[PDB]
Design a binder for these strands. Sequence first.
DNA 1: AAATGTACGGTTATTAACCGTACATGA
DNA 2: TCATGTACGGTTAATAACCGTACATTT
Lengths: 82, 69, 82, 69, 159, 159
Amino acid sequence: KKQRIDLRLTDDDKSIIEEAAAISNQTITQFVVASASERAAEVIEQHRRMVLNEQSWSLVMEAITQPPAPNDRLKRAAKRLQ
Amino acid sequence: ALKKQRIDLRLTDDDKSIIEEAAAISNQTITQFVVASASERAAEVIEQHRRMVLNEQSWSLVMEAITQP
Amino acid sequence: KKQRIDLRLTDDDKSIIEEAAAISNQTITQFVVASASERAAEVIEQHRRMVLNEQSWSLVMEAITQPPAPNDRLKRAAKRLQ
Amino acid sequence: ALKKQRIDLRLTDDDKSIIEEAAAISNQTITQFVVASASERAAEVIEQHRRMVLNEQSWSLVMEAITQP
Amino acid sequence: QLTIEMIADAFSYDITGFDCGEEALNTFLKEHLKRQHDGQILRGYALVSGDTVPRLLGYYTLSGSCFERGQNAPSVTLGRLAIDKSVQGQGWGEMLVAHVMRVVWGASKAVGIYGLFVEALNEKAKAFYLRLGFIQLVDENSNLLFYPTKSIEQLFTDD
Amino acid sequence: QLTIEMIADAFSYDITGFDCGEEALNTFLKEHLKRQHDGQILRGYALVSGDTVPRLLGYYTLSGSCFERGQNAPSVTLGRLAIDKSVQGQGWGEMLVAHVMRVVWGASKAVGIYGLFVEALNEKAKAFYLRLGFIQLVDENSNLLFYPTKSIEQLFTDD
DNA sequence: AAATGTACGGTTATTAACCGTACATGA
DNA sequence: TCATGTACGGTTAATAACCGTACATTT
């Protein structure tokens, strides 16, 4: 526990956080860290998980099993890289 | 409507790293991401607590009604 | 916060509670009180709420709209009460 | 296995009353109701954390794979 | 000289040697009612003797309840009911049930209450309440019995 | 003398006056990449100059991902990608995409990776990736484009 | 004798919530 | 100028976890 987060907030946000933490039988820091980190995991999981419908899934499977050859513009970009 | 109040959290390296990068993914400062996550969780807890309090008081009416010496 | 609860428990139960509280970023007392009171509210609401199916609901409605007259034995029980 | 360890909780009158009366409804002593509720909630948190840790480590291999100076 | 009274704050009753035949209702007396594990959800009434320290020979617990269609309507539920062996087979069990209906009757005059529910663990309990006029419910609610308030109204006005 | 390197621990780059045309990608640079808000989920690479203090004129972020049918298969997703206005219209945007696939190709040699996903916010970005050979998906996934690893294999093998 | 459920109070090491402080940016 | 996001460290009042203690059953 060697890190830290400093915040400025309105009286309204501070007040409702203080009272929801008291209702939850939690310190302010526990309530805020739990709210932010649980919400972080939601953002992160939406960022890595590509839920594909069956048509999009089929297009990916077609690209995997029958891969196209790179076009002229794309090969030209890789030569400047090299 | 100034941000005249303050809060500092001391946390682990993993807690801050997942919060930092989730704010980066959301393209929000650490302040927005954390304070918005907490307030909207706070409003949910208070609204639920407000319903439960009035529900429990409603149950206490029946309790007093069947309370006869 | 003037009340208290004292517990005896095995090393196994105590250890897994200590480690689940640490994972949850919670004290032992917060984790235990929250676990017990949340399960209490579940027990209490299941105890007072009678979810009736459509046949049972109709039997209750029939008893309410067309109330039976108390039988002789029930009438006899209220006599000794008075 | 003996019950050789202890725990004491300081709590509100409302938390203690709802715990006492729910234990009364369940016809369990306060010790059974409290320790059983906490210990199976603890096992759920331990199980979920173990899956989350192994999932996160799985994601870290892909992270290290795309980490190239 | 037995009397029916409410289990108040003190609980200063002689419950030594109490036994009702079912240890579950016995342990509930020694480990819950005597600790005042009631007042917010459970309300207990007691069949007590006239001794210098009143002895407890019976009790029941009441709780506010509601029944739903799955609308919502409030009711009262009789939880546990125990009669000590010393005074069994003399009608005190049904007199307690009649006393249960009386407080339900009194409660219905101040708040809306449509009837009295009871859960019959086994079928002997079902036969006990069916005999007093309770209506048994079906399927998922097959261990629930119901008696409407209007029938209770009849019982006490008539007598 | 521009070079592509990975944004390491330090981030000791001159980003003063950086402007890609879209402020969202500018603020993401000053408020996330510059604070090392990366390393665990987001991995950043940088197009840097050869000055005595290296200037940053472009960047992209990569993240491990997976695509599912709703089976589960792993992939890599290109998040943000920005090119400073000073060096726009010179092909550096496509060279960064070529460097992305190179890292995907390098990553695919050590772990299973089936391709590269990208989310096209607007329709210009969609045209940009469609032009490079990306395959656009449909309906709910209509703002995602995909390029398989085997096509990336052909591109650097042949070159 | 030993285990156990319930019950009360003192001790101590930990820390949450403030507060001062600092700097750089944008209104 | 002022509001703001990010950042570091000290002070103090509050208390979580513990331990001893007690008593009445139950084995």
